[PDB]
């Protein structure tokens, strides 16, 4: 009762301004994504040139998938951390996450920085079409 009446005084809201981040934050997120995509390209080139060597207990396919997943997840986490650094004290996404009332830092990060990898059955989006995920992509594209 008493906290709901004080909330009548102070008030609470969620708006678009909460989702917006600084221009520097957006630039850093973009740079992290570019670096991650470049690293994934390098890993793919290593695999194509047969330089890659299987991790114990894993096939070359499995170890390549694990390396690419690790790169993409680390980039996703770094973009999320940048977005969360951007948040102000007044930010209401941050307010709800800090109180624990609703939401998570994952949600804040997806809202502000990067939605992340879409995975089905524990693997990246499968090659449903013949040797490709969608008709718009070229065959044998393992890029992000």
């Amino acid at each position: 009762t008493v906290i709901n009446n004080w909330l009548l005084i102070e008030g609470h809201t969620i708006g678009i301004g909460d989702s917006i981040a600084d221009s520097k934050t957006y630039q850093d997120i973009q740079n992290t994504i570019k670096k991650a995509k470049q690293d994934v390209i390098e890993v793919i080139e290593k695999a194509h040139n047969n330089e890659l060597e299987p991790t114990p207990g894993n096939t070359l396919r499995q170890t390549f998938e694990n390396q690419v997943n690790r790169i993409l997840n680390d980039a996703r986490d770094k973009t999320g951390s940048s977005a969360q650094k951007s948040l102000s004290e007044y930010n209401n996404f941050k307010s709800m996450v800090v109180s624990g009332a609703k939401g998570s830092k994952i949600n804040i990060s997806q809202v502000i920085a990067v939605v992340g990898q879409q995975n089905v059955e524990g693997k990246r989006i499968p090659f449903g079409f013949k040797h490709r995920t969608l008709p718009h992509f070229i065959k044998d594209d393992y890029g992000p």
Binding site: N69, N73, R76, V115, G116, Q118, N119
Partner: peptide, 8 residues
């Protein structure tokens, strides 16, 4: 929808 370690 996040990653392989998260949720779909």
């Amino acid at each position: 929808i996040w990653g392989i370690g998260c949720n779909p």
